[PDB]
Amino acid sequence: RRHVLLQAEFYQRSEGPDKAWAQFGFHFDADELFHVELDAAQTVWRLPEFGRFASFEAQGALQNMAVGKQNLEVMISNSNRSQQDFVTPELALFPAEAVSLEEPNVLICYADKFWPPVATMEWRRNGAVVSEGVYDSVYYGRPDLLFRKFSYLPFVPQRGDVYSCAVRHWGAEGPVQRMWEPEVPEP
Amino acid sequence: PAVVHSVRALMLAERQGGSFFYGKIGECHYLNGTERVRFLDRQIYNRQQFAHFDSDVGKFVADTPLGEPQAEYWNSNAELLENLMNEVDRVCRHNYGILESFTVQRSVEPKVRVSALQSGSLPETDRLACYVTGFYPPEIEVKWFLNGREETERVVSTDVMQNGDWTYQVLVVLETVPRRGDSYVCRVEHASLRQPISQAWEPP
Ligand SMILES: *[C@H]1O[C@H](CO)[C@@H](O)[C@H](O)[C@H]1NC(C)=O
C-alpha cells in the first residue's frame, strides 16, 4: 500500500474585519500527528502517547512562519490582491459509538470541504450552548486544497435531550447547523 | 524520543474587504515504504497551486502563470534544488523510520455491535444495524449473512467515517423484518484481526 506524510503550513489575513491566522502541522494520510502552538512555541501531538515515541523542535515551525508571513505579503502584491470564492462548509454530526442511554459517549461534528480555513463550532443541548469537555481540532487539509475541522462534545445520552452543532465560516452572515437526538425503540 | 525533521523554508517568493491565503504543503509520498520515496513541495496562493517541486523531476514546475516567475528564479539556484532533493533522505526517509511503528503499523481492532432499529411507520424492527467502530487502518470489509447467504441488495452502508482521533467507523444496515429461527450475522474483516468477527444478532 502507499502512505503520505504531509508538512502543511498556512498563513492568512483578512482585511474587511482585520484578522490574521497561521498553522504548522504534520499529517499522516488524513490524520494529524501534531500541530505547533505558534504563540506558546509548543508541539501538540494529536494523541498524547505519540509524544513518548517521537519529538519535534517547535523552533523549526517559527522559522518557517517568518518566511510564510513574508511570502504571503509578496503574493498579495504579485496577484494584484486577487480574491478566491469562499466555499461554505458541509457539516457531519454523529456519535463515536452506538448510543446506549446513561453510557458516556462523544458527539462528533466535522465541517468539510470549506475554504478559507476559518470556522468556529457551537454546541447546543435543548437550545442552550454547552462547552464542557469540547475539543476543537486545527484545520486538516482535504482534497482540492479545502479543509476539514472536528469538534467533540462529551455527553451522557438521556431521554428528551436534543443536540445541535453550528459552524460559522468567516464569510457568511448565517450558520450551517445539524440536529441529533437518540432514537430509543419501545418493547 | 527521536527528532522528526521539518522541511525548511529555503525558497522565498520574489516580488515581480479582502482575504489573502498562502500555503506550503511538503508531501513525503511513500510507495512500498522506503523502496520508492517521492517529495512534492506545493506552493499555494488562495486556492491555486502556483508551483511545485517534484523530486523525480528534480526542478520546480509552474502550475499557473503567477508561479512562472517564482519557478525560474528557484531553478536558477542549484544549491536550493540540491537541498530540496536532499529532503527525500533528510525528511522523508528519516521521518518514516521514526514514525512507522505507531503510524504505518498502527492496528486498532473494530468493536462490532448489532442493534435493531424500529420502522417509524409500523410497530416492528425494519432494519438491523452493524456499528463497526474505533478501528485503524481505515480500510475494512463488513458483510451481512442471512441464513448463511451474503446479502447485497437489502444492505445500505454509510461511507467509512473519519472520527479524527486516528480511529474510523462504518454503519452497515440490513433492511429486513427479523424472523425468529433466522440467523443474522455481521461479518467484519480488518488487518488488525487474525480471525474475522462474526457478530450474530439474537432477539429477546
Ligand atoms: C494588475 O495586473 C497587471 C500585472 O499583473 C498590471 O499591469 C495592471 O495594471 C493591473 N490590472 C488591471 C487593474 O487592469
Short mmCIF file of C-alpha atoms and ligand atoms in Angstrom, two decimals:
data_model
loop_
_atom_site.label_atom_id
_atom_site.label_comp_id
_atom_site.label_asym_id
_atom_site.label_seq_id
_atom_site.Cartn_x
_atom_site.Cartn_y
_atom_site.Cartn_z
CA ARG A 1 0.00 0.00 0.00
CA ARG A 2 1.02 3.71 -0.37
CA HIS A 3 1.23 6.28 2.51
CA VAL A 4 1.80 10.11 2.64
CA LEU A 5 3.46 12.25 5.37
CA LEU A 6 2.49 15.95 4.98
CA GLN A 7 4.04 19.11 6.43
CA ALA A 8 1.10 21.54 5.97
CA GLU A 9 1.60 25.29 6.63
CA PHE A 10 -0.95 28.10 6.04
CA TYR A 11 -0.56 31.87 6.68
CA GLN A 12 -3.66 34.05 6.05
CA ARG A 13 -5.04 37.54 6.76
CA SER A 14 -8.45 39.16 6.11
CA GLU A 15 -8.86 42.97 5.80
CA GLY A 16 -12.64 43.66 5.82
CA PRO A 17 -12.63 42.84 9.54
CA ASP A 18 -8.79 42.92 10.11
CA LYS A 19 -7.62 39.46 11.38
CA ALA A 20 -4.69 37.04 10.75
CA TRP A 21 -4.07 33.30 11.31
CA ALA A 22 -1.18 30.82 10.88
CA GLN A 23 -0.81 27.00 11.23
CA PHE A 24 2.03 24.39 11.12
CA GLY A 25 1.10 20.69 11.27
CA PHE A 26 2.33 17.17 10.39
CA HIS A 27 -0.30 14.81 8.92
CA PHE A 28 -0.04 11.00 8.23
CA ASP A 29 -2.52 10.35 5.37
CA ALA A 30 -5.77 12.06 6.59
CA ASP A 31 -4.94 12.13 10.37
CA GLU A 32 -2.88 14.78 12.27
CA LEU A 33 0.36 13.66 14.03
CA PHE A 34 0.89 17.09 15.64
CA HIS A 35 0.48 20.88 15.31
CA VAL A 36 2.80 23.57 16.77
CA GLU A 37 1.01 26.13 19.00
CA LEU A 38 2.89 29.11 17.43
CA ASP A 39 2.18 31.59 20.32
CA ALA A 40 3.38 29.15 23.06
CA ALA A 41 6.02 27.61 20.69
CA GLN A 42 4.92 24.10 21.89
CA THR A 43 4.47 20.86 19.86
CA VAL A 44 0.98 19.33 20.48
CA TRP A 45 0.66 15.65 19.41
CA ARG A 46 -2.96 14.74 18.48
CA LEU A 47 -2.67 11.67 20.78
CA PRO A 48 -0.58 12.27 23.95
CA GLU A 49 1.22 8.88 23.65
CA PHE A 50 2.73 9.95 20.23
CA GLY A 51 4.95 12.27 22.34
CA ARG A 52 6.71 9.29 24.06
CA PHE A 53 7.75 7.78 20.65
CA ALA A 54 8.94 10.99 18.95
CA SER A 55 9.63 14.74 19.44
CA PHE A 56 9.66 17.88 17.20
CA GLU A 57 11.68 21.12 17.63
CA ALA A 58 8.99 23.91 17.57
CA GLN A 59 11.71 26.49 16.66
CA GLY A 60 11.60 24.94 13.12
CA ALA A 61 7.90 25.88 12.77
CA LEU A 62 8.52 29.54 13.87
CA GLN A 63 11.49 29.91 11.44
CA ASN A 64 9.11 28.79 8.64
CA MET A 65 6.45 31.26 9.99
CA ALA A 66 8.93 34.11 9.36
CA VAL A 67 9.09 33.21 5.60
CA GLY A 68 5.38 32.29 5.34
CA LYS A 69 4.19 35.72 6.51
CA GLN A 70 6.67 37.31 4.06
CA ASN A 71 5.66 35.08 1.06
CA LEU A 72 2.04 35.93 1.90
CA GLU A 73 2.67 39.73 1.54
CA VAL A 74 4.67 39.14 -1.69
CA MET A 75 1.93 37.07 -3.44
CA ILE A 76 -0.84 39.52 -2.22
CA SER A 77 1.21 42.05 -4.23
CA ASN A 78 2.22 39.75 -7.17
CA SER A 79 -1.52 38.80 -7.67
CA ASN A 80 -2.87 42.43 -7.76
CA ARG A 81 -4.72 41.42 -4.47
CA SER A 82 -6.83 38.82 -6.31
CA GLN A 83 -9.70 37.12 -4.37
CA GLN A 84 -10.92 33.47 -4.36
CA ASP A 85 -14.59 32.43 -3.98
CA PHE A 86 -15.21 31.13 -0.43
CA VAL A 87 -16.71 27.63 -0.11
CA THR A 88 -19.30 27.15 2.66
CA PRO A 89 -18.74 24.07 4.86
CA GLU A 90 -20.79 20.88 4.83
CA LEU A 91 -21.48 19.52 8.29
CA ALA A 92 -21.36 15.92 9.62
CA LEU A 93 -22.67 15.05 13.11
CA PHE A 94 -22.60 11.52 14.53
CA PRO A 95 -21.71 9.74 17.79
CA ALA A 96 -18.32 7.95 18.18
CA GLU A 97 -20.12 4.75 19.41
CA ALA A 98 -23.69 3.42 19.07
CA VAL A 99 -25.76 5.02 21.79
CA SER A 100 -26.83 3.29 25.00
CA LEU A 101 -28.74 5.51 27.47
CA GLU A 102 -26.63 6.54 30.56
CA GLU A 103 -23.46 5.24 28.78
CA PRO A 104 -20.95 8.09 28.27
CA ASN A 105 -20.33 8.82 24.59
CA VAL A 106 -18.97 11.59 22.33
CA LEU A 107 -20.86 13.56 19.61
CA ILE A 108 -18.50 14.32 16.68
CA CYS A 109 -19.16 17.31 14.42
CA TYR A 110 -16.88 17.94 11.42
CA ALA A 111 -17.07 20.81 8.93
CA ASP A 112 -15.84 19.60 5.49
CA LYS A 113 -14.85 20.92 2.02
CA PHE A 114 -14.50 24.56 3.20
CA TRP A 115 -12.09 27.42 2.29
CA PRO A 116 -10.74 29.68 3.72
CA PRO A 117 -9.64 27.69 6.83
CA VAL A 118 -11.58 29.85 9.40
CA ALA A 119 -14.61 28.22 11.11
CA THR A 120 -16.00 28.05 14.69
CA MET A 121 -18.35 25.35 16.02
CA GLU A 122 -21.05 26.00 18.68
CA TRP A 123 -22.69 23.10 20.55
CA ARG A 124 -26.22 23.41 22.00
CA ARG A 125 -28.25 20.94 24.12
CA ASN A 126 -32.05 21.60 24.22
CA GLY A 127 -31.32 25.09 22.70
CA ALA A 128 -28.65 26.07 25.32
CA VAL A 129 -24.89 26.48 24.50
CA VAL A 130 -22.64 23.74 26.03
CA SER A 131 -18.78 23.97 26.10
CA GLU A 132 -17.76 21.36 28.77
CA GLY A 133 -15.07 18.91 27.57
CA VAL A 134 -15.23 20.23 23.98
CA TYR A 135 -12.06 19.65 21.89
CA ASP A 136 -11.71 21.70 18.66
CA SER A 137 -9.20 20.44 16.07
CA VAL A 138 -6.84 22.52 13.88
CA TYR A 139 -7.66 22.75 10.14
CA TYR A 140 -6.97 19.43 8.29
CA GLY A 141 -6.01 19.62 4.58
CA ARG A 142 -8.56 17.90 2.31
CA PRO A 143 -8.65 17.16 -1.45
CA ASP A 144 -8.94 20.22 -3.82
CA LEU A 145 -6.95 22.41 -1.34
CA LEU A 146 -10.01 22.51 1.00
CA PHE A 147 -10.10 21.94 4.79
CA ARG A 148 -11.90 19.89 7.48
CA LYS A 149 -12.25 20.73 11.23
CA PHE A 150 -13.51 18.41 14.02
CA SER A 151 -15.30 19.30 17.30
CA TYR A 152 -16.09 16.74 20.04
CA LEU A 153 -18.82 17.04 22.71
CA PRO A 154 -18.60 14.51 25.57
CA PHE A 155 -22.21 13.65 26.59
CA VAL A 156 -24.29 11.13 28.55
CA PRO A 157 -27.22 10.01 26.34
CA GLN A 158 -30.54 10.60 28.17
CA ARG A 159 -34.21 10.60 27.06
CA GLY A 160 -35.56 14.02 25.90
CA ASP A 161 -32.18 15.62 25.03
CA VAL A 162 -31.73 17.20 21.54
CA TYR A 163 -28.20 18.30 20.48
CA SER A 164 -27.08 20.70 17.72
CA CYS A 165 -23.75 21.69 16.10
CA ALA A 166 -23.46 25.03 14.22
CA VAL A 167 -20.48 26.24 12.14
CA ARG A 168 -19.81 29.93 11.38
CA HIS A 169 -17.48 30.27 8.36
CA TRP A 170 -15.55 33.61 8.01
CA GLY A 171 -17.55 34.92 5.00
CA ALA A 172 -21.18 34.08 5.86
CA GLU A 173 -23.91 36.14 7.70
CA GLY A 174 -25.51 32.71 8.53
CA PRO A 175 -24.60 29.44 10.35
CA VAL A 176 -24.72 25.87 8.93
CA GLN A 177 -26.43 23.64 11.57
CA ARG A 178 -27.29 19.96 12.28
CA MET A 179 -29.51 18.36 14.96
CA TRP A 180 -29.05 14.92 16.58
CA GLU A 181 -31.30 13.02 19.04
CA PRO A 182 -31.22 9.47 20.50
CA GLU A 183 -33.66 7.00 18.82
CA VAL A 184 -34.91 4.64 21.58
CA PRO A 185 -37.33 1.91 20.50
CA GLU A 186 -40.22 0.54 22.66
CA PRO A 187 -40.52 -3.12 23.96
CA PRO B 1 12.08 10.08 21.88
CA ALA B 2 13.59 10.71 18.39
CA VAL B 3 13.53 14.01 16.42
CA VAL B 4 11.08 14.46 13.49
CA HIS B 5 12.70 16.63 10.77
CA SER B 6 10.88 19.58 9.11
CA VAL B 7 11.34 20.87 5.54
CA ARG B 8 12.96 24.33 5.98
CA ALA B 9 11.51 27.31 4.03
CA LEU B 10 14.65 27.60 1.82
CA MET B 11 12.76 29.25 -1.11
CA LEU B 12 11.45 32.86 -0.75
CA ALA B 13 8.74 34.28 -3.06
CA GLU B 14 10.23 37.12 -5.20
CA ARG B 15 8.30 40.37 -5.95
CA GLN B 16 7.52 40.91 -9.70
CA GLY B 17 -12.79 43.69 2.29
CA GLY B 18 -10.23 41.04 1.21
CA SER B 19 -8.93 37.58 2.27
CA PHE B 20 -5.35 36.51 1.44
CA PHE B 21 -4.01 32.95 1.92
CA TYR B 22 -0.55 31.41 1.34
CA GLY B 23 0.01 27.65 1.83
CA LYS B 24 3.09 25.39 1.90
CA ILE B 25 2.48 21.58 1.71
CA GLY B 26 5.61 19.35 1.81
CA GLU B 27 4.41 15.86 0.76
CA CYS B 28 6.62 12.79 1.51
CA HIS B 29 4.87 10.14 -0.72
CA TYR B 30 5.95 6.57 0.22
CA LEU B 31 5.43 3.61 -2.20
CA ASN B 32 6.42 0.18 -0.71
CA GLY B 33 7.79 2.25 2.26
CA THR B 34 11.45 3.31 1.73
CA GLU B 35 11.70 1.31 -1.59
CA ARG B 36 10.33 4.32 -3.60
CA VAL B 37 10.01 7.80 -1.97
CA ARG B 38 8.79 10.99 -3.74
CA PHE B 39 8.94 14.53 -2.21
CA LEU B 40 6.45 17.12 -3.55
CA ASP B 41 6.66 20.73 -2.25
CA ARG B 42 3.39 22.53 -3.11
CA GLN B 43 3.28 26.37 -3.06
CA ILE B 44 -0.32 27.72 -2.94
CA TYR B 45 -1.78 31.25 -3.04
CA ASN B 46 -5.53 31.43 -2.29
CA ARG B 47 -6.80 28.02 -3.59
CA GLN B 48 -4.47 27.88 -6.66
CA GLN B 49 -1.15 25.99 -6.51
CA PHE B 50 1.17 28.42 -8.44
CA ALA B 51 4.13 25.97 -8.46
CA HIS B 52 5.51 22.67 -7.10
CA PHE B 53 8.85 20.83 -6.80
CA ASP B 54 8.94 17.10 -7.77
CA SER B 55 11.98 15.07 -6.51
CA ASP B 56 11.52 12.82 -9.61
CA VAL B 57 11.75 15.90 -11.96
CA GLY B 58 14.45 17.49 -9.68
CA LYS B 59 13.29 21.02 -10.73
CA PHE B 60 10.38 23.39 -9.85
CA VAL B 61 7.36 23.24 -12.25
CA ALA B 62 4.99 26.25 -12.60
CA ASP B 63 1.30 25.15 -12.38
CA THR B 64 -0.02 28.70 -13.10
CA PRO B 65 1.27 31.92 -14.76
CA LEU B 66 1.79 33.54 -11.29
CA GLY B 67 4.13 30.59 -10.45
CA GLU B 68 6.28 31.04 -13.63
CA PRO B 69 8.46 33.94 -12.25
CA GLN B 70 8.99 32.04 -8.94
CA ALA B 71 9.86 28.70 -10.61
CA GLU B 72 12.52 30.25 -12.93
CA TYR B 73 14.30 32.04 -10.00
CA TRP B 74 14.24 28.99 -7.67
CA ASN B 75 15.51 26.76 -10.57
CA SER B 76 18.42 29.26 -11.06
CA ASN B 77 19.76 28.39 -7.52
CA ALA B 78 21.35 24.90 -7.94
CA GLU B 79 22.15 24.70 -4.18
CA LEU B 80 18.40 25.12 -3.36
CA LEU B 81 17.43 22.36 -5.87
CA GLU B 82 20.11 20.07 -4.33
CA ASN B 83 18.96 20.98 -0.77
CA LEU B 84 15.31 20.22 -1.70
CA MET B 85 16.40 16.86 -3.27
CA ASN B 86 18.33 16.07 -0.01
CA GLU B 87 14.95 16.43 1.85
CA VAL B 88 13.95 12.98 0.35
CA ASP B 89 16.59 11.45 2.69
CA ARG B 90 16.69 14.26 5.33
CA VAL B 91 12.87 14.42 5.95
CA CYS B 92 11.03 11.60 4.07
CA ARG B 93 13.44 8.66 4.82
CA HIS B 94 14.39 9.99 8.35
CA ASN B 95 10.74 10.63 9.41
CA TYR B 96 9.46 7.23 8.04
CA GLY B 97 11.89 5.28 10.33
CA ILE B 98 10.87 7.22 13.50
CA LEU B 99 7.05 7.20 12.87
CA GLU B 100 6.49 3.80 11.08
CA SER B 101 5.98 1.91 14.44
CA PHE B 102 2.88 3.95 15.57
CA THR B 103 1.57 5.07 12.11
CA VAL B 104 2.27 2.63 9.18
CA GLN B 105 1.91 -0.23 11.77
CA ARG B 106 -0.95 1.24 13.85
CA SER B 107 -3.55 -1.54 14.35
CA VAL B 108 -6.75 -0.91 16.39
CA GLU B 109 -9.45 -3.61 16.29
CA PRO B 110 -13.02 -2.82 15.26
CA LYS B 111 -15.63 -3.11 18.02
CA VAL B 112 -18.82 -4.63 16.40
CA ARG B 113 -22.38 -4.19 17.76
CA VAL B 114 -25.71 -5.18 16.08
CA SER B 115 -28.91 -3.48 17.18
CA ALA B 116 -32.49 -3.50 15.81
CA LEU B 117 -33.91 -0.15 14.56
CA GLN B 118 -37.73 0.35 14.67
CA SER B 119 -39.70 1.20 11.46
CA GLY B 120 -41.09 4.65 12.33
CA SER B 121 -44.23 3.74 10.27
CA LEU B 122 -45.02 0.29 11.82
CA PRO B 123 -44.64 -1.47 15.24
CA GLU B 124 -41.70 -3.70 14.16
CA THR B 125 -37.93 -3.76 13.60
CA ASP B 126 -37.39 -2.92 9.87
CA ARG B 127 -33.54 -2.65 9.99
CA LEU B 128 -30.59 -4.41 11.65
CA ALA B 129 -27.65 -2.04 12.19
CA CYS B 130 -23.99 -3.23 12.36
CA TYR B 131 -21.97 -0.44 14.06
CA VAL B 132 -18.24 -1.10 13.35
CA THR B 133 -16.24 1.42 15.46
CA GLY B 134 -12.81 2.57 16.80
CA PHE B 135 -10.64 0.97 14.04
CA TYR B 136 -7.30 1.76 12.29
CA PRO B 137 -6.37 1.38 9.48
CA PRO B 138 -9.44 2.89 7.70
CA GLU B 139 -9.78 0.03 5.09
CA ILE B 140 -12.36 -2.57 6.29
CA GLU B 141 -14.83 -5.21 4.94
CA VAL B 142 -18.28 -5.58 6.60
CA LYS B 143 -20.81 -8.12 5.23
CA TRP B 144 -24.29 -9.30 6.30
CA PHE B 145 -25.18 -13.03 6.11
CA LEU B 146 -28.84 -14.16 6.32
CA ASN B 147 -29.11 -17.94 7.00
CA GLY B 148 -25.52 -18.33 5.65
CA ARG B 149 -26.16 -16.27 2.46
CA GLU B 150 -24.42 -12.91 1.80
CA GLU B 151 -26.99 -10.09 1.28
CA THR B 152 -26.05 -7.14 -1.00
CA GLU B 153 -29.44 -5.95 -2.34
CA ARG B 154 -31.01 -5.17 1.10
CA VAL B 155 -27.80 -3.73 2.69
CA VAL B 156 -27.17 0.07 2.73
CA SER B 157 -23.76 1.15 4.06
CA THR B 158 -22.53 4.62 5.20
CA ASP B 159 -19.12 5.82 3.94
CA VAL B 160 -16.18 4.87 6.24
CA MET B 161 -16.17 7.95 8.53
CA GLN B 162 -13.01 9.62 9.97
CA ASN B 163 -13.55 10.13 13.76
CA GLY B 164 -10.49 12.49 13.64
CA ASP B 165 -8.86 10.80 16.72
CA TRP B 166 -6.93 8.29 14.48
CA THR B 167 -9.96 5.88 14.68
CA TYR B 168 -12.61 5.21 11.94
CA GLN B 169 -16.23 3.87 11.92
CA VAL B 170 -18.82 2.47 9.45
CA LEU B 171 -22.53 1.55 9.75
CA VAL B 172 -23.90 -1.27 7.51
CA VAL B 173 -27.69 -1.62 7.74
CA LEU B 174 -29.61 -4.73 6.61
CA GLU B 175 -33.20 -3.82 5.58
CA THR B 176 -35.22 -6.80 6.95
CA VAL B 177 -38.01 -7.58 9.44
CA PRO B 178 -36.19 -10.09 11.69
CA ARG B 179 -37.91 -13.53 11.94
CA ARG B 180 -37.45 -15.97 14.89
CA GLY B 181 -35.39 -19.01 13.72
CA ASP B 182 -33.43 -16.89 11.20
CA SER B 183 -29.65 -16.28 11.56
CA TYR B 184 -28.39 -12.69 11.02
CA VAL B 185 -24.57 -12.38 11.19
CA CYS B 186 -22.43 -9.24 10.70
CA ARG B 187 -19.00 -10.39 9.48
CA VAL B 188 -16.06 -7.93 9.78
CA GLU B 189 -12.61 -8.41 8.16
CA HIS B 190 -9.80 -5.96 9.13
CA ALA B 191 -5.92 -6.03 9.05
CA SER B 192 -5.97 -5.91 12.94
CA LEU B 193 -7.80 -9.33 13.03
CA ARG B 194 -6.32 -12.91 12.78
CA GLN B 195 -9.95 -14.37 12.58
CA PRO B 196 -12.90 -12.23 11.22
CA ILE B 197 -15.53 -11.03 13.75
CA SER B 198 -18.89 -12.77 13.17
CA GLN B 199 -21.34 -10.78 15.38
CA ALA B 200 -24.71 -12.61 15.37
CA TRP B 201 -27.96 -10.86 16.23
CA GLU B 202 -30.48 -12.69 18.51
CA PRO B 203 -33.95 -11.34 19.56
CA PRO B 204 -35.39 -11.20 23.14
C1 LIG C 1 -2.61 44.32 -12.49
O1 LIG C 1 -2.16 43.25 -13.34
C2 LIG C 1 -1.10 43.71 -14.20
C3 LIG C 1 0.14 42.98 -13.72
O2 LIG C 1 -0.25 41.77 -13.06
C4 LIG C 1 -0.94 45.25 -14.19
O3 LIG C 1 -0.17 45.61 -15.34
C5 LIG C 1 -2.28 46.03 -14.24
O4 LIG C 1 -2.04 47.44 -14.11
C6 LIG C 1 -3.29 45.53 -13.18
N1 LIG C 1 -4.51 45.08 -13.91
C7 LIG C 1 -5.57 45.90 -14.09
C8 LIG C 1 -6.03 46.76 -12.91
O5 LIG C 1 -6.03 46.11 -15.22
#
